[PDB]
Amino acid sequence: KNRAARVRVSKGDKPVTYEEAHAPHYIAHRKGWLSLHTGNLDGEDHAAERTVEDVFLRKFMWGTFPGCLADQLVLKRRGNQLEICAVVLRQLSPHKYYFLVGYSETLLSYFYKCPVRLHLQTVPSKVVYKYL
Amino acid sequence: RKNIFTGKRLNIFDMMAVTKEAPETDTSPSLWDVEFAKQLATVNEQPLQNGFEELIQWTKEGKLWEFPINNEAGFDDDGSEFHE
Amino acid sequence: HYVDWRMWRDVKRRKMAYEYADERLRINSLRKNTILPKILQDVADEEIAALPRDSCPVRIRNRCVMTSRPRGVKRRWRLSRIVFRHLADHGQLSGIQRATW
Amino acid sequence: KFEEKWSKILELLRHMVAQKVKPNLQTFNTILKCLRRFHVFARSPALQVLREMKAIGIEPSLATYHHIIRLFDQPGDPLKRSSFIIYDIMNELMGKRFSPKDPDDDKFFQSAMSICSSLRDLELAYQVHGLLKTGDNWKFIGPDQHRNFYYSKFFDLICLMEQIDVTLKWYEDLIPSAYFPHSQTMIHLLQALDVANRLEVIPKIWKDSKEYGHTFRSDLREEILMLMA
Amino acid sequence: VDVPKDLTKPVVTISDEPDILYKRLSVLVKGHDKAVLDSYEYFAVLAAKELGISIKVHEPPRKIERFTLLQSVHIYKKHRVQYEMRTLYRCLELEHLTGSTADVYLEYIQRNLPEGVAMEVTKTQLEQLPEHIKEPIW
Ligand SMILES: [Mg+2]
Ligand SMILES: [Mg+2]
């Protein structure tokens, strides 16, 4: 049987998100892409460096906002800019969010040598697409 | 019904037509002049009011690319001509 | 802090091959010709063979940058077939989708 | 006493001209900043300093006019002299674009508004605020604390004086985009709806108050209920 | 009621040197999504009409690059997975521009280039014969 990126059915008590409920054969039919850049286009270059930056960002943000991320990130590149769009929870205090936004935006700008901006969208609870 | 500007004034200083032609431009500003210029850049200091201004600030600093895109920006091979 | 020692040995090889790249280039030019004397070409055969082994570019291996896997590596992403699919199957690689036709 | 100080200062000025030293804008600003202590006496000397600046072709900056209004301004009921001064300054400043010259140039707008509030003149506040929008003069308003104070004296004077249909257009523009109101501003706005017999908006002024952090303000809740009942 | 009484506009000085001419300006944008290109076309075409520029649009054929990989971590050769990257094109052919007009239009659309969309701008300049070419020296 196939296993990649599939959430196995259960009794019915397990909540899943939209992206987590669709398998790889829906990535261009019912889902989009979590990262958007030009590396993988025909005739373009530096697709390998853009991938290592993505892998590091998803981990930097998972450990920098522990227990706060409601769903996967959405990385966007428009020229020199790098826009990180995240959906976070409302448990943490806003004072601590503004601290981490300025700490991460700055640390990542000096690391990758690019202007970085972070966009948060708070939700009360993790959105549920269905129950498996 | 009298304007404030019109009336008696102090006559200690004579009116000046022009200033000194050439100052000590070669001499570099002192600490007192470098710290006083930082106080004149704070009066007009204000937070970014819109998205466009952020782009403008970044572009001046040098973080954001200058458009239209030139693939050779910041790369002149020592001012070398083709015959070299 | 690399994945394994096999990876670490390749990092050193790519560094030593970058320092001697020009010296090796200039010497090989003498060997790859029929113009210069054989006596001179014989001396260049011994000078480039006395350079360290790790300076030779053929001793470099394109391993995966995440798992250090020597085989099954895609050169465009520098990833192994197993790691590439893990990111592509979760929609983390821009433009990559599954093919059907 | 001032009479002794004035003579002392004139000596340094006579020495400045005796050593071939030309004064700058800062030289004149210190004089005005120093003269602030002697509110009453320094009033006339101050103008003489201003006239001198114009004589040598030194354009007074925003800080220069700031040290003047503070000096002329005094906690008095008549305020006859203060009224005439500010009207003349605006006509001079009207339709101008300013550049940073003195560190205190930012403190001009906060003071000028305070004068209009003490004078209860709305036609003058439209000129002070209309001068803040020309070109890029909005950058001289100053830090947050100076910005909140400017828009409070300004908006509190709008509700009191002008029609209610126009007061509500200023309440939609400024708040919250410009400044976050204080409990008093909500009160003054409530005392304008009463005067205009438009008490149908009270259920909306309470919603916005809770959204601005005034949910647990004793004084506010004690004035909204009385008006409705 | 609150509106800037006066507005400041960026200074545009006129130089003495002559301006550059462009017989054609070919803009080729790539992307993985077609609706993002259909939407970028509508924006770039409308921005040209308002600036007084001639523009023609055509859609070059797409390119699909495929490749296959093993399905399992160990053995099971027969069973594999095939992937593809789809590259869609959209060419905007402008005509009869100047150096300044193109400098403005390109900056306007390059900045608003959406995510996952590249661009290849081919500029065709008009020149005159050099001085040495007018007559022979020998
Ligand atoms: Mg199967
Ligand atoms: Mg090999």
XYZ file of C-alpha atoms and ligand atoms in Angstrom:
686
model
C 0.000 0.000 0.000
C 0.985 3.638 -0.467
C 1.921 5.661 2.603
C 3.433 8.979 1.500
C 1.707 12.003 3.028
C -1.449 10.061 3.906
C -3.266 10.308 7.237
C -4.638 6.833 7.884
C -8.321 6.518 8.697
C -9.256 5.966 12.339
C -12.394 5.464 14.413
C -13.520 9.018 13.627
C -12.059 10.970 16.547
C -8.965 12.378 14.794
C -9.173 15.935 13.392
C -7.176 16.871 10.298
C -6.589 20.019 8.274
C -7.254 20.571 4.582
C -3.624 20.178 3.522
C -3.127 17.213 5.864
C -6.259 15.470 4.516
C -5.210 15.395 0.839
C -2.507 13.112 -0.526
C 0.284 13.860 -3.034
C -1.888 13.150 -6.085
C -3.936 16.277 -5.267
C -1.050 18.766 -5.049
C -2.020 20.537 -8.291
C -5.700 19.506 -8.405
C -7.040 20.389 -4.944
C -3.983 21.846 -3.174
C -1.369 24.413 -4.044
C 2.294 24.734 -3.113
C 3.547 25.858 0.282
C 6.587 27.534 -1.312
C 6.541 29.722 -4.424
C 9.707 30.682 -6.303
C 11.315 30.482 -9.744
C 14.057 27.920 -9.113
C 12.128 24.969 -10.539
C 11.094 26.758 -13.742
C 12.607 25.891 -17.101
C 15.907 27.668 -17.651
C 16.130 28.970 -14.080
C 18.909 28.336 -11.582
C 19.605 27.949 -7.867
C 16.782 25.522 -7.123
C 19.008 23.687 -4.634
C 19.815 26.714 -2.473
C 16.167 27.783 -2.339
C 15.315 24.324 -0.972
C 17.818 24.408 1.899
C 16.537 27.841 2.921
C 12.975 26.508 2.981
C 13.862 23.442 5.058
C 15.639 25.624 7.617
C 12.844 28.199 7.828
C 10.136 25.647 8.600
C 12.254 24.365 11.500
C 13.378 27.783 12.741
C 9.723 28.828 12.993
C 8.565 25.547 14.540
C 10.998 25.940 17.438
C 10.758 29.714 17.665
C 6.941 29.614 17.947
C 6.581 26.411 20.005
C 3.028 25.123 20.233
C 1.663 28.166 18.399
C 1.623 27.176 14.722
C -1.831 26.027 13.635
C -0.874 24.945 10.109
C 2.133 24.707 7.817
C 3.941 27.826 6.650
C 3.574 29.563 3.291
C 6.845 30.937 1.924
C 6.773 33.557 -0.820
C 9.623 35.115 -2.794
C 9.195 38.278 -4.882
C 12.645 39.195 -6.140
C 14.870 39.979 -3.172
C 12.096 39.809 -0.570
C 11.133 36.719 1.419
C 7.625 36.751 2.901
C 6.741 34.233 5.611
C 2.994 33.790 6.119
C 1.907 31.803 9.175
C -1.320 30.850 10.939
C -0.833 30.920 14.709
C -2.955 30.358 17.802
C -4.270 32.870 20.334
C -2.922 31.293 23.535
C 0.291 33.321 23.620
C 0.217 36.982 24.572
C 0.544 39.620 21.824
C 3.500 41.136 23.677
C 5.436 37.930 23.017
C 4.379 37.736 19.367
C 5.715 41.205 18.563
C 9.007 40.274 20.224
C 9.393 37.139 18.108
C 8.343 38.883 14.890
C 11.098 41.464 15.291
C 13.614 38.893 16.501
C 13.003 36.495 13.612
C 12.642 39.104 10.857
C 15.989 40.584 11.894
C 17.947 37.387 12.531
C 16.855 35.955 9.182
C 17.694 39.134 7.263
C 21.327 38.989 8.404
C 21.523 35.224 7.842
C 20.165 35.081 4.281
C 21.104 38.650 3.269
C 17.585 39.547 2.165
C 14.727 41.666 3.529
C 12.416 39.335 5.443
C 8.869 40.047 6.584
C 6.567 37.853 8.664
C 2.761 37.864 8.446
C 0.691 36.254 11.199
C -2.991 35.281 11.076
C -4.313 34.200 14.470
C -7.115 31.650 14.771
C -8.905 30.636 17.996
C -8.367 26.909 17.432
C -6.797 24.664 14.824
C -9.144 24.617 11.844
C -10.625 21.180 11.173
C -11.509 20.011 7.668
C -12.970 16.664 8.740
C -12.585 13.850 11.272
C -10.926 10.565 10.321
C -2.853 96.928 14.217
C 0.941 96.615 14.077
C 2.894 93.670 12.705
C 5.431 92.087 15.034
C 8.190 92.050 12.411
C 7.920 95.824 11.981
C 9.433 97.826 14.826
C 12.699 98.328 16.655
C 15.414 95.682 16.425
C 18.846 94.991 17.868
C 21.530 96.747 15.812
C 24.581 94.882 17.133
C 25.030 92.668 14.059
C 25.421 94.249 10.635
C 23.492 92.744 7.744
C 25.468 90.167 5.759
C 25.143 89.919 1.981
C 27.044 86.670 1.335
C 28.895 84.105 3.424
C 32.490 82.914 3.156
C 33.247 81.674 -0.347
C 35.232 78.535 0.551
C 35.096 76.879 4.000
C 37.368 74.122 5.346
C 35.638 71.422 3.327
C 38.737 69.203 3.438
C 38.566 69.083 7.237
C 36.301 66.293 8.430
C 33.352 67.003 10.754
C 34.120 66.635 14.442
C 32.206 64.519 16.948
C 30.108 67.553 17.885
C 29.078 67.918 14.237
C 28.425 64.210 13.670
C 26.185 63.907 16.741
C 24.254 67.101 15.970
C 23.355 65.814 12.504
C 21.900 62.718 14.180
C 19.565 64.982 16.170
C 18.296 66.654 12.982
C 17.416 63.270 11.454
C 15.195 62.455 14.454
C 12.774 65.395 14.262
C 11.460 64.025 10.956
C 11.701 60.457 12.261
C 8.319 58.731 12.099
C 7.150 55.124 11.791
C 6.377 53.683 8.384
C 2.916 54.933 7.444
C 2.288 52.649 4.444
C 3.740 49.791 2.436
C 5.315 51.988 -0.230
C 7.418 53.817 2.356
C 8.904 50.545 3.606
C 10.054 49.760 0.070
C 11.491 53.274 -0.235
C 13.380 52.941 3.049
C 14.804 49.540 2.105
C 15.830 50.770 -1.345
C 17.741 53.701 0.154
C 19.469 51.455 2.695
C 20.367 49.016 -0.079
C 18.458 45.934 1.081
C 15.937 45.904 -1.772
C 16.864 45.661 -5.435
C 16.750 48.727 -7.658
C 14.347 48.366 -10.542
C 14.327 47.856 -13.447
C 16.465 44.783 -12.867
C 20.065 44.931 -14.089
C 21.872 41.603 -13.843
C 25.236 43.426 -13.676
C 24.362 45.684 -10.740
C 27.268 46.348 -8.412
C 29.682 44.468 -10.698
C 32.130 46.494 -12.781
C 35.213 44.430 -13.565
C 37.722 47.043 -12.375
C 36.591 49.402 -15.128
C 38.179 47.139 -17.731
C 37.599 47.697 -21.437
C 37.047 44.930 -23.965
C 40.557 45.309 -25.386
C 42.023 44.234 -22.028
C 28.226 18.756 12.567
C 27.887 17.123 9.170
C 25.791 13.993 8.727
C 28.651 11.487 8.822
C 32.386 11.094 8.342
C 31.867 10.107 4.700
C 30.333 13.547 4.170
C 33.136 15.248 6.099
C 35.781 13.595 3.918
C 34.089 14.945 0.781
C 33.942 18.475 2.211
C 37.717 18.396 2.656
C 38.175 16.996 -0.852
C 36.134 19.814 -2.394
C 38.243 22.321 -0.445
C 41.637 20.937 -1.466
C 40.493 20.655 -5.087
C 39.552 24.352 -5.045
C 43.023 25.445 -3.894
C 45.006 23.446 -6.474
C 42.519 23.942 -9.318
C 44.655 26.608 -10.993
C 48.001 24.914 -10.336
C 46.655 21.658 -11.779
C 45.128 23.531 -14.720
C 48.391 25.220 -15.691
C 50.383 21.979 -15.511
C 47.905 19.879 -17.496
C 48.029 22.416 -20.334
C 51.669 21.441 -20.839
C 50.805 17.736 -20.955
C 47.807 18.111 -23.301
C 49.682 19.099 -26.440
C 52.081 17.868 -29.114
C 53.974 21.175 -29.329
C 56.270 21.221 -26.316
C 59.172 18.764 -26.027
C 58.694 15.323 -24.538
C 61.423 16.109 -22.003
C 59.380 18.999 -20.613
C 56.105 17.066 -20.730
C 57.751 14.287 -18.714
C 58.598 16.719 -15.912
C 55.013 17.993 -15.766
C 53.762 14.403 -15.519
C 55.701 14.079 -12.249
C 54.778 17.489 -10.817
C 51.014 16.976 -11.074
C 51.299 13.380 -9.834
C 53.166 14.582 -6.727
C 50.242 16.778 -5.679
C 48.022 15.457 -2.868
C 45.440 12.852 -3.821
C 42.457 14.772 -2.436
C 43.257 17.620 -4.851
C 42.083 15.481 -7.775
C 38.514 16.367 -8.833
C 37.567 12.806 -9.833
C 37.735 11.813 -6.154
C 34.748 14.057 -5.392
C 31.333 12.474 -4.877
C 27.995 14.266 -5.214
C 26.314 13.101 -2.030
C 22.969 14.202 -0.667
C 23.303 17.321 1.471
C 20.721 16.037 3.977
C 21.474 12.305 4.296
C 24.951 11.832 2.744
C 23.624 9.219 0.321
C 26.117 8.593 -2.515
C 23.698 7.062 -5.031
C 20.231 8.067 -6.162
C 20.946 11.807 -6.002
C 19.295 14.432 -8.203
C 21.905 16.969 -9.277
C 19.486 19.889 -9.625
C 18.366 19.788 -5.981
C 21.345 17.913 -4.479
C 18.923 15.593 -2.694
C 18.321 11.866 -2.574
C 15.254 10.288 -4.137
C 13.934 9.610 -0.630
C 14.312 13.157 0.690
C 13.172 14.773 -2.559
C 9.921 12.795 -2.474
C 9.338 13.603 1.197
C 9.329 17.318 0.375
C 7.515 16.973 -2.952
C 4.791 14.742 -1.515
C 4.032 17.372 1.153
C 3.887 20.233 -1.356
C 7.081 21.918 -0.153
C 8.855 22.020 -3.542
C 7.610 24.812 -5.791
C 6.140 23.539 -9.044
C 6.804 19.851 -8.349
C 3.746 17.657 -8.853
C 3.061 14.042 -9.745
C 2.873 13.123 -13.420
C -0.112 11.470 -15.087
C -0.606 11.064 -18.827
C 16.464 89.623 37.419
C 15.941 89.903 33.675
C 17.190 93.490 33.424
C 20.639 92.359 34.566
C 20.632 89.257 32.360
C 19.645 91.208 29.244
C 22.670 93.475 29.672
C 24.900 90.437 30.212
C 23.727 88.701 27.034
C 24.260 91.809 24.903
C 27.936 91.741 25.908
C 28.526 88.287 24.424
C 26.773 89.459 21.257
C 29.042 92.506 21.077
C 32.029 90.198 21.553
C 30.733 87.899 18.807
C 30.781 90.819 16.365
C 34.145 91.974 17.758
C 35.808 88.653 16.819
C 34.396 88.329 13.276
C 31.970 85.588 14.337
C 28.630 85.292 12.544
C 25.593 83.976 14.455
C 23.546 81.020 13.254
C 19.970 79.873 13.793
C 20.951 78.025 16.972
C 22.550 81.157 18.432
C 19.194 82.942 18.270
C 17.215 79.904 19.440
C 19.145 79.627 22.711
C 18.277 83.251 23.499
C 14.562 82.555 23.095
C 14.770 79.241 24.956
C 16.594 80.965 27.815
C 14.169 83.904 27.969
C 11.260 81.532 28.666
C 11.735 81.834 32.433
C 10.804 85.541 32.332
C 7.364 85.090 30.799
C 6.128 88.666 31.162
C 9.254 90.785 30.732
C 10.879 88.882 27.859
C 7.782 89.278 25.651
C 8.989 92.444 23.918
C 12.719 91.522 23.869
C 11.745 88.290 22.110
C 10.259 90.076 19.097
C 13.430 92.157 18.807
C 15.380 88.899 18.526
C 12.987 87.662 15.836
C 13.285 90.904 13.872
C 17.066 90.539 14.101
C 16.932 87.049 12.588
C 15.030 88.443 9.604
C 17.564 91.269 9.282
C 20.513 88.927 8.675
C 18.396 86.803 6.350
C 18.177 83.867 8.775
C 14.879 82.082 8.199
C 13.217 81.229 11.541
C 12.621 77.493 11.791
C 9.773 75.762 13.621
C 11.753 75.756 16.875
C 12.159 79.537 16.760
C 8.395 80.061 16.627
C 8.039 77.383 19.313
C 10.113 79.302 21.859
C 8.054 82.431 21.156
C 4.549 81.051 21.697
C 5.624 79.321 24.909
C 7.038 82.622 26.162
C 4.027 84.760 25.240
C 1.674 82.028 26.445
C 0.949 82.439 30.153
C -1.744 81.065 32.491
C -3.982 84.100 32.119
C -7.682 84.547 31.485
C -7.624 87.459 28.989
C -4.886 86.142 26.664
C -5.169 89.284 24.544
C -1.488 89.379 23.577
C -1.206 85.642 22.901
C -4.123 85.792 20.458
C -2.566 88.489 18.277
C 0.840 86.786 18.130
C -0.282 83.383 16.857
C -2.477 84.859 14.118
C 0.520 86.688 12.652
C 2.825 83.661 12.845
C 0.449 81.449 10.865
C 0.119 83.944 8.010
C 3.915 83.885 7.772
C 4.127 80.089 8.007
C 1.103 79.496 5.763
C 1.858 77.580 2.580
C 5.429 76.576 3.409
C 7.525 73.415 3.413
C 9.978 72.993 6.278
C 13.306 71.199 6.612
C 15.051 70.010 9.793
C 17.274 72.749 11.216
C 16.935 72.656 15.016
C 16.336 69.594 17.227
C 13.272 71.280 18.762
C 11.511 71.903 15.434
C 9.190 68.993 16.246
C 7.777 70.636 19.390
C 6.063 73.419 17.415
C 2.752 71.790 16.508
C 2.015 70.454 19.992
C 2.326 73.957 21.449
C 0.425 75.819 18.725
C -2.573 73.527 19.206
C -2.487 74.143 22.960
C -2.744 77.869 22.229
C -5.805 77.394 20.023
C -7.409 75.205 22.688
C -6.811 77.870 25.333
C -8.178 80.483 22.913
C -11.082 78.264 21.783
C -10.528 79.239 18.140
C -11.326 76.578 15.544
C -10.591 78.647 12.430
C -6.976 78.864 13.601
C -6.670 75.135 14.309
C -7.633 74.413 10.702
C -4.632 76.495 9.630
C -2.263 74.832 12.098
C -3.444 71.392 10.992
C -3.682 72.460 7.354
C -0.018 73.437 7.591
C 0.848 69.982 8.948
C -0.455 68.237 5.813
C 1.339 70.322 3.179
C 4.267 68.530 1.579
C 5.962 66.377 4.215
C 5.437 68.564 7.287
C 3.485 65.722 8.924
C 6.879 64.340 10.005
C 7.453 67.222 12.452
C 4.505 66.245 14.671
C 6.923 64.404 16.949
C 6.987 61.176 18.955
C 3.926 59.239 20.086
C 3.387 61.165 23.324
C 3.527 64.437 21.384
C 1.243 62.998 18.703
C -1.452 61.874 21.149
C -1.455 65.270 22.869
C -1.786 67.160 19.581
C -4.799 65.180 18.374
C -6.481 65.387 21.793
C -6.482 69.172 22.148
C -7.415 69.335 18.462
C -10.306 66.868 18.471
C -11.577 68.071 21.853
C -11.860 71.541 20.307
C -13.708 70.194 17.259
C -16.560 68.561 19.176
C -17.063 71.692 21.275
C -17.221 74.227 18.434
C -18.270 72.891 15.032
C -21.411 71.189 13.767
C -22.023 67.597 14.813
C -22.256 66.291 11.243
C -18.672 67.458 10.703
C -17.466 66.361 14.148
C -18.379 62.773 13.267
C -16.363 62.903 10.040
C -13.275 63.838 12.059
C -13.997 61.018 14.513
C -14.049 58.449 11.701
C -10.823 59.734 10.122
C -8.532 60.354 13.096
C -9.590 57.462 15.336
C -8.064 54.841 15.337
C -5.850 55.497 12.330
C -4.161 58.538 13.899
C -4.379 58.247 17.693
C -6.108 56.151 20.318
C -8.520 58.300 22.353
C -8.449 58.914 26.087
C -11.425 58.597 28.417
C -11.877 62.377 28.387
C -12.231 62.607 24.602
C -15.082 60.091 24.709
C -16.757 62.291 27.327
C -16.403 65.540 25.376
C -17.797 63.741 22.334
C -20.752 62.588 24.433
C -21.381 66.169 25.572
C -21.600 67.234 21.912
C -24.233 64.668 20.936
C -26.374 65.934 23.815
C -26.038 69.507 22.557
C -27.105 68.419 19.057
C -29.966 66.149 20.207
C -28.531 63.118 18.395
C -28.652 60.646 21.279
C -29.291 57.766 18.845
C -25.510 57.364 18.429
C -24.838 56.620 22.112
C -25.179 52.829 21.570
C -22.266 53.198 19.126
C -19.985 55.403 21.227
C -20.042 52.740 23.940
C -19.038 49.989 21.511
C -16.029 51.983 20.328
C -15.072 52.816 23.919
C -14.763 49.125 24.788
C -12.674 48.646 21.641
C -10.307 51.402 22.841
C -9.799 50.061 26.371
C -12.373 52.167 28.246
C -14.620 49.251 29.228
C -13.892 49.716 32.953
C -13.698 53.514 33.219
C -15.914 54.589 36.114
C -16.259 58.202 34.972
C -17.290 57.174 31.454
C -19.998 54.676 32.403
C -21.377 57.199 34.906
C -21.980 59.794 32.159
C -23.375 57.568 29.399
C -26.208 56.213 31.542
C -27.366 59.590 32.863
C -27.691 60.956 29.329
C -29.807 58.035 28.111
C -32.089 58.104 31.167
C -12.507 65.891 5.587
C -8.831 65.205 6.326
C -6.880 65.404 3.063
C -3.372 66.692 2.221
C -3.912 70.288 1.156
C -0.806 70.105 -1.049
C 1.023 67.122 -2.515
C 4.688 66.572 -3.336
C 5.610 64.829 -6.574
C 8.963 63.195 -7.381
C 11.296 65.380 -9.413
C 11.863 64.315 -13.026
C 14.644 66.384 -14.571
C 15.139 66.521 -18.331
C 18.660 65.763 -19.530
C 20.516 67.202 -22.503
C 21.644 63.824 -23.835
C 19.320 62.146 -26.355
C 17.068 59.276 -25.366
C 17.322 55.641 -26.427
C 14.936 54.049 -28.920
C 13.486 50.534 -28.783
C 12.018 48.991 -31.925
C 10.582 46.067 -29.952
C 10.320 45.055 -26.308
C 9.631 41.346 -25.838
C 8.592 40.239 -22.348
C 8.483 36.493 -21.690
C 7.034 35.456 -18.327
C 7.164 31.879 -17.057
C 5.075 30.244 -14.377
C 3.579 27.061 -13.015
C 0.039 28.499 -12.902
C -1.893 29.720 -15.932
C -4.477 31.889 -14.175
C -1.702 33.898 -12.524
C -0.389 34.612 -16.023
C -3.834 35.386 -17.421
C -4.175 37.868 -14.553
C -0.705 39.358 -15.028
C -1.471 39.786 -18.732
C -4.632 41.763 -17.963
C -2.602 44.021 -15.667
C 0.301 44.535 -18.067
C -1.937 45.159 -21.081
C -4.116 47.690 -19.266
C -1.053 49.492 -17.906
C 0.255 49.857 -21.464
C -2.998 51.263 -22.857
C -3.050 53.956 -20.166
C 0.560 54.879 -20.981
C -0.026 54.948 -24.744
C 1.964 51.872 -25.766
C 1.328 49.328 -28.504
C 1.210 45.760 -27.190
C 0.518 42.332 -28.680
C 0.036 39.139 -26.675
C 0.507 35.509 -27.686
C 0.860 32.273 -25.732
C 3.921 30.148 -26.598
C 3.616 26.369 -26.239
C 4.153 24.980 -22.758
C 6.995 22.710 -21.668
C 6.603 19.732 -19.326
C 9.726 18.172 -17.807
C 9.171 14.721 -16.303
C 11.320 12.261 -14.379
C 10.833 9.013 -12.479
C 12.076 7.819 -9.094
C 11.928 4.593 -7.123
C 8.834 4.187 -4.966
C 10.486 2.178 -2.183
C 13.554 2.772 -0.043
C 14.887 -0.717 -0.798
C 14.487 -2.956 -3.877
C 11.093 -3.247 -5.625
C 12.588 -1.810 -8.820
C 9.410 -2.350 -10.862
C 7.494 0.162 -8.735
C 8.347 3.816 -9.304
C 6.933 7.328 -9.000
C 6.893 9.887 -11.809
C 7.009 13.653 -11.275
C 6.631 16.680 -13.527
C 7.248 20.424 -13.565
C 4.937 22.374 -15.875
C 6.281 25.641 -17.298
C 3.718 27.921 -18.946
C 4.643 30.966 -21.018
C 3.085 34.295 -21.973
C 4.854 36.747 -24.290
C 4.050 40.476 -24.364
C 5.436 42.098 -27.529
C 5.649 45.879 -27.237
C 6.688 48.195 -30.051
C 7.962 51.729 -30.648
C 9.122 52.763 -27.180
C 11.790 55.041 -25.748
C 14.358 54.461 -23.040
C 12.364 56.439 -20.488
C 8.952 54.946 -21.259
C 10.343 51.410 -21.057
C 12.237 52.257 -17.866
C 8.908 53.183 -16.262
C 6.670 50.424 -17.615
C 9.194 47.687 -16.839
C 9.737 48.899 -13.275
C 5.969 49.041 -12.788
C 5.358 45.456 -13.908
C 8.615 43.962 -12.598
C 7.769 45.070 -9.060
C 4.277 43.555 -9.333
C 5.658 40.292 -10.703
C 3.781 37.653 -8.669
C 5.291 34.733 -6.812
C 6.552 31.874 -8.954
C 6.740 34.005 -12.104
C 10.024 34.822 -13.835
C 10.653 37.158 -16.766
C 12.997 37.390 -19.758
C 12.989 40.906 -21.224
C 14.559 41.132 -24.685
C 15.314 44.729 -25.684
C 15.844 45.589 -29.360
C 17.651 48.925 -29.595
C 17.989 51.143 -32.662
C 21.460 52.507 -33.425
C 23.168 54.423 -36.221
C 26.247 53.534 -38.223
C 29.452 54.510 -36.371
C 31.628 57.309 -37.685
C 34.391 54.965 -38.861
C 31.861 53.018 -40.968
C 30.741 55.997 -43.059
C 33.727 55.915 -45.431
C 36.830 53.728 -45.787
C 40.255 54.922 -44.713
C 42.347 52.922 -47.207
Mg 1.622 0.496 -5.978
Mg 32.713 9.754 -9.713
